[PDB]
Amino acid sequence: QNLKSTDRAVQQMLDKAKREGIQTVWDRYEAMKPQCGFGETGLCCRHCLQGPCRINPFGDEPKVGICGATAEVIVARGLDRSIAAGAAGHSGHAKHLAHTLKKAVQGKAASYMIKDRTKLHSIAKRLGIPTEGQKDEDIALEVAKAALADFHEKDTPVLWVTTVLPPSRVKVLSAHGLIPAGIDHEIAEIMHRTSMGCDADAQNLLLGGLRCSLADLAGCYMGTDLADILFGTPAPVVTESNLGVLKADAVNVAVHGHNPVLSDIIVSVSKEMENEARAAGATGINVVGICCTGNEVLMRHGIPACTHSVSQEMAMITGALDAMILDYQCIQPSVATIAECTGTTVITTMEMSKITGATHVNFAEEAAVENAKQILRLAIDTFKRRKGKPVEIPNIKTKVVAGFSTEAIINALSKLNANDPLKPLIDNVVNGNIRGVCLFAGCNNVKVPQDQNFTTIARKLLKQNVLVVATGCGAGALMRHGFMDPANVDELCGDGLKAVLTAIGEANGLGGPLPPVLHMGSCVDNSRAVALVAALANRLGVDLDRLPVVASAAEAMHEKAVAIGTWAVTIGLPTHIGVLPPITGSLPVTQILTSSVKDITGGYFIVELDPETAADKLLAAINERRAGLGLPW
Amino acid sequence: QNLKSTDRAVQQMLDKAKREGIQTVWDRYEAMKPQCGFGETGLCCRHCLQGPCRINPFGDEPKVGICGATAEVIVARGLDRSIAAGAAGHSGHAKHLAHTLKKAVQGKAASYMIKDRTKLHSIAKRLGIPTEGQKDEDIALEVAKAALADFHEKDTPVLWVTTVLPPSRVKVLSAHGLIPAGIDHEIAEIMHRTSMGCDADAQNLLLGGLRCSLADLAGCYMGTDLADILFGTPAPVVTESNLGVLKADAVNVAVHGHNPVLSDIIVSVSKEMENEARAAGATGINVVGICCTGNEVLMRHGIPACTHSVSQEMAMITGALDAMILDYQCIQPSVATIAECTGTTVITTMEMSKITGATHVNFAEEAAVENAKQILRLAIDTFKRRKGKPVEIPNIKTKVVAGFSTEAIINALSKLNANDPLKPLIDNVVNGNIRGVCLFAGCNNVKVPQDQNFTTIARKLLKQNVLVVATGCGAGALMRHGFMDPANVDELCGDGLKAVLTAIGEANGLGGPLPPVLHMGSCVDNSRAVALVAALANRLGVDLDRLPVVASAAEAMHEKAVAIGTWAVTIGLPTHIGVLPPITGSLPVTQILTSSVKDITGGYFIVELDPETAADKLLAAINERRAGLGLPW
Ligand code: SF4
Ligand code: SF4
Ligand code: FES
Ligand code: FES
Ligand SMILES: [Fe+2]
Ligand SMILES: [Fe+2]
């Protein structure tokens, strides 16, 4: 099972699933081999009913689409649609939060409120919304309105791009026409321009893609901003991760999907229902996280993470998962069928994300507590049905220190320099104790032994004194392998990095270092990394494409990860992707994305499937940036 | 060549292209055979980087997507994305027109103006915008603002749906949650819900699709409304069609794409530049139409139609096409390469629709006349370069009577009944002189011998006294085969239909009948057919799903045609499609689209590749509606 996942808890559940004849994502992958080489290389088009069209990567006909679409057009159009789809996810998430905030302050959803007033005011200031002599509720109404306004054309561009990147960066992007006019506007324009008989120039198409990726960034940043206002800005918290956080004697409830609007209420209501759970013979309700919504409640509340991404089915295979509460995104629909074998109650809650065979309980912010109780009572009923049934919860978990929002990081650093908190970080970049910064982001992918790329690359970078930050299922991988436990600093970290982590930790009263990797939160919270990097850029008076900062979507899967990778490139970062996106069928497109885009945005993709090699390439990128700043490396 | 196109002019140019070694759309199709059976049936998914996934239509593994996505999910998700892409095209078009109207009335684009004041006022009234004591420019500003507001969420649903369908229809749709909240909002929501690990219930997905198809309808109706305000509501006009409208001794300029914002100015400026053209040795500038933008200028100005859809390259093969002026949609990018062989200057004009190797001349409404002159001077230069070069323009053309907007149809009928103009039409439906109404819409498709389905089906329906109306390349097919020439009424029409066409024509002073088929305009002008059918519904006091009205996308190709077909079904029409959409890989999805959707909207798809059989099925659908109204059939 080591060939499927490097996580021992997952391996144990794979053996259980095999024994019990429960088909998994890895079995469905094996059944799909060999996969279509046209799709793999991007050389397939189904954008009209004359198709499907394909182009042989090499050899003879077909060489061109029926309408005349070249390999470079077909590849660029497919990629653009993936970016649009990612943008649609992150911005749908953000939109949901914007409506929730509006309802909350209009008195229509009393389960929700302004929890972080400071964040609300700072966001208002950043957007140009006056706060002086204004009621919080009115300020919040204006912020929510501004959020919703960024989805469409208006007299200003997307403020959740133009107000979050340094002016010099916005100028570079504006010069190339890359600043989005409206989030849903760009999504629609991509779908239009990539439809049959429209845009048919690879560079033009890809520029469109870069712009749509910034619409995605805006959705991410908006999602983080709004979630922080509503639910609180994360601060350092200690919890645990992996399947061992499940408890046989508790009602185990996984929150899974993305939106904290749902999970955050589940967490609070579950505490209120402890006595009901105990009435049913349980110790209480044990809420655990899967995927991003698990990350959201881990970051804010220390809710333990059960599992992530590709291994999500394994939580169910334990036999102890009484409910899986879903909103949207990254949920393998197999869970609905597996639930019939495992006893788990899978519950959908959002109108646009249902799964055949799952129970649907409409969630309305207006009735959030009521709807949460209904859902949790289904979970309690399910716990009762497994009375006396043996379960197999792998006794495997790690300690996780998390909650490193950008505010939290700035605060931690401020203990070393109160009025110039970024300076200690920059000092240590300059003196070589910190070589650079690497953001690990995005998914696991069944094609890559689970977590192998994240851990292999992280290990090499940490030994080379790279400050590693992580989000989403990248943070999931690293947390499950001990990278968020400060007890592992001596083993994992180079002497320089150790010194800095220790110095910061001891100044924050820890008697010990920060963890080896800083968990910056969910996938939308990649926007937090942007806030940190942009703040460093502003402090240094240089653009992001001069900073020794890189990203790695080491095991990418979702269209959202493609969008994130693309905006990482667009804002100026060397951006590693550890799975093949469908671009290799066009050398010109590949060359643009991995090379000539450097001349446009300063960022570039690094496509590298071998993780040792990827680490070397990321180190080379970091060191090139160091040299560019006149620093030793 | 009869196996490729039933159009003799096209056949002649195919022989020329063969002789000269110029590859065509038919050659690229042959080179693509056999096409992928997974794509053909819809059983392929590339929505994440674990893919490509496929499902064998029959047999053994693979049976399910890697994430657990079933055949019914994969098929529904692919279809939904096609609908969104169509919606994005039609609504991008509409949005462009809305911005143009706004600029025009704000004094920023003096080449544009309110040409149809009556239409402006009627639209304002329909939207609830007060006109009483208001300046036209202010009314137009409010209409343009309303248009742009329909793209996003607001306190009202999409008004270009809710104000254009009868209340009873809106109620049925609202009950099923199918009324769009915002055009780009729905497009984005589709892309989100169809992304990995989101919506995974076929019915839920398809309901989303129906709603997004209404966003497309809104974009179409908005496009027609705005184009009519700006450029004039069509009225009956006589012109010609087919390659014989090209003139060797003239500067031949094709307008190609969709948006009249561009073509309409080309037409007016070309008249102003006659003397310059004559200075260059030409007789003048001969503007001719291809595809929808050709339909727009044919409908308003009687500009002759050169060709349509699948045969667009053949205009170039003549050697006499000096320029092809492009905006977006349905342009085979092969034209840019073919231009190098034929001498034609291919000019793109829109930032989001470029073609490698074509000349790009940015068009800005603010400088429309200037930009038009620049473009037409390139065409004149090109005419000069072919001095003394033989050309082969097939001497083949038909007479075309067109310009049947819904206003024009109502006016024509009003000559038989001034104060109840729809009544004469309804009278003849009731007495059997008109069996029903069929709308032919959409594209040609290289898979179907060009025009064969449109003409075969139209011939059968006309003999059975069906009133046939047509738009887009359906109108193109029928016009090129003589179906818009009143001289062909005796040959084509049943006695009942002939009687009615003759009665209406003679009351309008023609000394002769209306044409066999009524040309209702471009693809967005399918919205005109909706206006007519909705007006008939209102007059009768019944919903559209009780009317003997059907649609046929007989040779469909573009994602836009899929969207149009889908909203035809959603508003309550039996809707024939004459090519296989990628749905046959899921019986449940097929059953929903062809059968159970009847219970939701009253409309349904009729998938039928054999045109004789399709005609029988359409007649059966019409007759079933007749019987439902208690009428003989
Ligand atoms: S858009 Fe072009 S390449 Fe794509 S399916 Fe249609 S004909 Fe083929
Ligand atoms: S979304 Fe599911 S079916 Fe589609 S490519 Fe990804 S794993 Fe395969
Ligand atoms: S030919 Fe396999 S992805 Fe289309
Ligand atoms: S396997 Fe051919 S369309 Fe994907
Ligand atoms: Fe996520
Ligand atoms: Fe069209």
Phi first, then psi: give them for residue B430, nearest 5 degrees. Answer: -65, -45
How far is A444 from B535, CA to CA, in rounded Å? Answer: 55
How far is B361 from A350, CA to CA, in rounded Å? Answer: 46
Element (H, E) at A499: helix A495-507
Phi-psi region of B29 (alpha: psi -120 to 50; beta: other; left: phi over 0): alpha
Ligand 3 centre distance from Cα of residue B52 (Å): 7
B68/A333 Cβ within 8 A: yes
Closest residue by Cα to residue B562 from B23, B33, B85: B85
* Contact between A289 and A305 (Cβ < 8 Å): yes
In this structure, which residues have their CB less than 5 angstroms from ion ligand 6?
B 292, 523
Instruction: Quickly count: other Cβ atoms within 10 Å of residue A403's Cβ.
Output: 22
How far is B286 from B308, CA to CA, in rounded Å? Answer: 17
Does the CB atom of residue B70 touch ligand 2 within 6 A? Answer: no
A65 touches chain B (CB under 8 A): yes
B198 interaction partners in chain A (CB closer than 8 Å): 89, 328-329, 331, 352-353
Q: Which of 248-307 (A) contact B at CB < 8 A?
A: none
Nearest-CA residue for ligand 1 atom 2 is A67
Q: What length is written for chain B?
A: 633
Number of the ligand closest to the Cα of B46: 2
Nearest-CA residue for ligand 3 atom 4 is A44
Q: What's the N-to-C CA distance of chain B in angstroms?
A: 40
Instruction: Quickly count: other Cβ atoms within 10 Å of residue B633's Cβ.
Output: 16
Three-state SS sequence of A155-182:
CCCCHHHHCCCCHHHHHHHHHCCCCCCC
Q: How many CB pairs under 8 A join A and B?
A: 329
Ligand 4 atom index nearest CA of A44: 3
How far is A220 from A218, CA to CA, in rounded Å? Answer: 5
The shortest CB-CB distance from B184 to any of A39, A85, A187 is to: A187
Q: Which of 200-219 (A) contact B at CB < 8 A?
A: 200-202, 204, 208
A47/B36 Cβ within 8 A: no
How far is A152 from A158, CA to CA, in rounded Å? Answer: 8
Q: Is B258 annotated as a binding residue?
A: yes
How much is the CA Rg of chain A, to the nearest whole Å?
Answer: 24
How far is A493 from A516, CA to CA, in rounded Å? Answer: 7
A69/B51 Cβ within 8 A: no
One-letter amino acid identity for A256? H
> Which site among B49, B329, B332 would you substitute to test the A interface, given the most A Cβ atoms closer than 10 Å to its Cβ?
B49
Strands A285-290 and B604-607: unpaired
Strands B467-471 and B517-521: parallel
Q: Which of 571-590 (B) contact A at CB < 8 A?
A: 579-582
B196 interaction partners in chain A (CB closer than 8 Å): 329-330, 557-559
Nearest-CA residue of chain A relative to B61?
A: A31
Structure tokens at A502: 């220790």
Structure tokens at A140: 């919040």
With the C-alpha atoms ordered A232, A236, A241, A244, is the resulting torsion angle positive or negative?
Answer: negative
Nearest-CA residue of chain B relative to A444?
A: B50
Resolution (A): 1.4
B25 interaction partners in chain A (CB closer than 8 Å): 66-68
How far is A190 from A212, CA to CA, in rounded Å? Answer: 7
Closest residue by Cα to residue A252 from A299, A289, A279: A289
Largest CA distance in chain A: 72
How far is B514 from B524, CA to CA, in rounded Å? Answer: 23
Treating both helix axes as pointing N-terminal to C-terminal, what angle do B71-105 and A183-193 enclose, rounded to 10 degrees?
A: 110
A76 touches chain B (CB under 8 A): no
DSSP A39-88: HHHT-EE-SBTT--EE--SSSSS--S-TTS--HHHHHHHHHHHHHHHHHH
What are the angstrom distances between the C-alpha of A128 and each of A105, A163, B9?
20, 9, 63
B192/A328 Cβ within 8 A: yes
A207 interaction partners in chain B (CB closer than 8 Å): none
Nearest-CA residue of chain B relative to A553?
A: B49
A447 interaction partners in chain B (CB closer than 8 Å): 49-50
How far is B213 from A162, CA to CA, in rounded Å? Answer: 33
* Contact between A141 and A105 (Cβ < 8 Å): yes
Structure tokens at B346: 């291919």
Strand partners, A469: A439, A518
How far is B94 from B599, CA to CA, in rounded Å? Answer: 32
How far is B98 from B96, CA to CA, in rounded Å? Answer: 5
A199/B353 Cβ within 8 A: yes
For each of the domains in chain B, give its residue range(s) and CATH number, in order of start.
Answer: 60-234 (1.20.1270.30), 235-403 (3.40.50.2030), 406-633 (3.40.50.2030)
Ligand 4 atom index nearest CA of B52: 4
Element (H, E) at A563: helix A559-570
Chain centroid offset of residue A266 CA: 21
* Contact between B472 and B439 (Cβ < 8 Å): no
Nearest-CA residue of chain B relative to A27?
A: B66
A331 interaction partners in chain B (CB closer than 8 Å): 197-198, 200
A581/B49 Cβ within 8 A: yes
B559/A196 Cβ within 8 A: yes
* Contact between A137 and A105 (Cβ < 8 Å): yes
Instruction: Quickly count: other Cβ atoms within 10 Å of residue B389's Cβ.
Output: 10
How far is B122 from A286, CA to CA, in rounded Å? Answer: 61
**Closest chain B C-alpha to A30 CA, distance in angstroms:** 9
How far is A266 from A322, CA to CA, in rounded Å? Answer: 14
Ligand 3 atom index nearest CA of A45: 4
Q: For residue A31, how many C-alpha atoms fall within 13 Å in the half-sphere facing its CB?
A: 20
Q: Is B45 annotated as a binding residue?
A: yes
Closest residue by Cα to residue A406 from A247, A236, A277: A236
B561 interaction partners in chain A (CB closer than 8 Å): 49
Structure letter (DSSP) for residue A515: P
Does the CB atom of residue B369 touch ligand 2 within 6 A? Answer: no
How far is B172 from B210, CA to CA, in rounded Å? Answer: 13
Residue A132, class by beta-carbon neighbours within 10 Å (0-12 exposed, 13-18 middle, 19+ buried)?
exposed
Phi first, then psi: give them for residue B422, nearest 5 degrees. Answer: -70, -25
How far is A431 from B482, CA to CA, in rounded Å? Answer: 82
* Contact between B603 and B580 (Cβ < 8 Å): no
DSSP B403-445: ---HHHHHHHHHTT-TT-THHHHHHHHHTTSS--EEEE-S---
Structure tokens at B485: 């020439």
Element (H, E) at B232: none
How far is B183 from B92, CA to CA, in rounded Å? Answer: 10
Q: What is the spatial order of strands in the sheet that B359-360 belongs to?
A: B359-360, B345-348, B321-326, B251-256, B285-290, B305-307, B237-241, B398-402
Ligand 3 centre distance from Cα of residue A74 (Å): 12
Does the CB atom of residue B46 touch ligand 2 within 6 A? Answer: yes
* Contact between A565 and A551 (Cβ < 8 Å): yes
Q: What length is written for chain A?
A: 633
Nearest-CA residue of chain A relative to B93?
A: A192
Closest residue by Cα to residue A153 from B87, B149, B157: B149
Structure tokens at B240: 């010609």
* Contact between B577 and B550 (Cβ < 8 Å): no
B52/A39 Cβ within 8 A: yes
Closest residue by Cα to residue B629 from B476, B478, B436, B409: B436
Closest residue by Cα to residue B484 from B620, B355, B295, B615: B295
Closest residue by Cα to residue A386 from A340, A347, A342: A342
How far is A570 from A589, CA to CA, in rounded Å? Answer: 15
* Contact between A601 and A169 (Cβ < 8 Å): no
Q: Is B48 annotated as a binding residue?
A: yes
**Closest chain B C-alpha to A183 CA, distance in angstroms:** 9
Q: Which of 18-57 (B) contact A at CB < 8 A?
A: 25, 28-29, 31-32, 35-36, 38-40, 44, 46-54
Phi first, then psi: give them for residue A51, nearest 5 degrees. Answer: -75, -170
Does the CB atom of residue B52 touch ligand 4 within 6 A? Answer: yes
Structure tokens at B460: 């059968």
Ligand 3 centre distance from Cα of residue B201 (Å): 24
Q: Is B220 annotated as a binding residue?
A: no
B197/A332 Cβ within 8 A: yes
Nearest-CA residue of chain A relative to B358?
A: A201
> 3-state class of A512 per DSSP?
coil
Q: For residue A144, how many C-alpha atoms fall within 13 Å in the half-sphere facing its CB?
A: 22
Strand partners, B553: B577
B78/A46 Cβ within 8 A: yes
Treating both helix axes as pointing N-terminal to C-terminal, what angle do B526-540 and B406-414 enclose, rounded to 10 degrees?
A: 50
Which approach determined this entry?
A: X-ray
A492 touches chain B (CB under 8 A): no
Strands B285-290 and B53-54: unpaired
A329/B195 Cβ within 8 A: yes
- Find the residues whose C-beta lies inside 6 A of ligand 1: A 45-48, 50-51, 53, 65-67, 69, 74, 196
How far is B270 from B257, CA to CA, in rounded Å? Answer: 18
Structure tokens at A422: 């970024």
